[PDB]
Amino acid sequence: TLTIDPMITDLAGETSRLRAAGPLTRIDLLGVPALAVTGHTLARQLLTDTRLVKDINAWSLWQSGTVTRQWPLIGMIDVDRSMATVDGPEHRRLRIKTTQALTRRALDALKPTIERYVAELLDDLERAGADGAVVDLKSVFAYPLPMRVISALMGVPSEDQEQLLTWYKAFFSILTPQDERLRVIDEMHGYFTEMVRRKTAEPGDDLTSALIYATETPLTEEEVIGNLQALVAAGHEGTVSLILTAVRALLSHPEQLRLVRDGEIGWETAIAETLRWDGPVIHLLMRFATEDIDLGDAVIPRGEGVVMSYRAIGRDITVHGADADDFDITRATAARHISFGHGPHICPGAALARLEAAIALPALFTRFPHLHPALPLDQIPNLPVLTQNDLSHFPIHLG
Ligand code: HEM
Ligand SMILES: C[C@]12CC[C@H]3[C@@H](CCC4=CC(=O)CC[C@@]43C)[C@@H]1CC[C@@H]2O
């Protein structure tokens, strides 16, 4: 069994240990055992296997009361009913209105909004960078942008977004005391409950109102609340990491940065290789076997929990080759990654996340062509967030 270090002290060694022990291996998540899927081919297979569900009531550890809400990771699994917790035909019903809102056409009408948030945040970088002062790319640029974009889509007031970010920081950190974590989870549920009620009595041009007023069976209020929570949480968290890890990877590989600025390699292709090599998700919790799953050299027992170790999956040497642990935007398999998932629960906002990074990254390097880091890589740790690739900071000189 591999114990996942909640402090993320040795992410590179742990990721390689997971790859070496895979494609299926036992992990320990803060005292709770589970199975981690670390192989790319096995992941794609299980992600489309209908004997694996997200419903926590299918977990034997939850049924028996062995895992309770005292577990610091329980907020990642015991969530309100939504597209993230259901499978089968009900899943399509809880997802279809959202996917209609995230089409290639639908995002075109949203593209100018993103471009304005980007331009506003670039000005914040310039203001904080007066007199050659080092600026935190994260806190000034990468962290606020995805929250402003998902808030505009969902209809979250601008005045409320700081509070949401404050809640999410405590929610993700393993250093949050468990009584405070549970209080924040409750306060967040109460916030989105009251927002859904407010939008029910006053709909707007936003996705929350669309989820309430669709004209199949209408979503229950619980399901709208659950979808809203999953959309804001995933919608703001992942893209922050993507923007920062892409900048970090290209600044430390200047010859590849030259390729994208000169147009030899598209930004969309650099974003794909960032997702494969250093993506926003480390481990995805959690799936549960409704019956014994015979793989042929291993069995997944009924009721067992199954984690998708997407970071290890991205480093799969069988699919990507011997240099899988290297960042190379020119590799042929960069588009074959599954860092947005696979199967029916594949990220519904994958196109929006790709668009946000595809706007922000060239915007950043056009506005500040000579930007460079103010800290070396060994002084940029991950935050203690076990399941997410969350960077502490990225100080830069604007140049
Ligand atoms: C770089 C940015 C992002 C990454 C890497 C990412 C990745 C993922 C992954 C790995 C999953 C779950 C796959 C699984 O179940 O195994 C997921 C689910 C989900 N994501 Fe994303 N995501 C990103 C951005 C977004 C955005 C922008 C939105 C919304 C606009 C979003 C909304 C969701 C939702 C609602 C789910 C649950 C879908 C379901 O269970 O049917 N995410 N995402
Ligand atoms: C894990 C995640 C952030 C946490 C999200 C999760 C989707 C379901 C969910 C809804 C909540 O109420 C809290 C956070 C969670 C648990 C997201 C899937 C993509 C992103 O990485």
XYZ file of C-alpha atoms in Angstrom, residues 69 80 167 171 179-193 229:
20
model
C -17.533 13.127 8.029
C -24.935 17.269 -2.903
C -14.374 29.262 1.550
C -12.206 23.554 1.785
C -14.645 21.441 12.602
C -13.869 24.526 10.499
C -13.937 22.476 7.282
C -17.408 21.126 8.066
C -18.624 24.612 9.016
C -17.377 26.004 5.688
C -18.995 23.162 3.715
C -22.287 23.980 5.459
C -21.887 27.723 4.857
C -21.225 27.065 1.168
C -24.274 24.814 0.862
C -26.327 27.552 2.512
C -24.974 30.159 0.095
C -25.779 28.238 -3.079
C -29.142 27.192 -1.628
C -21.760 23.707 -6.461
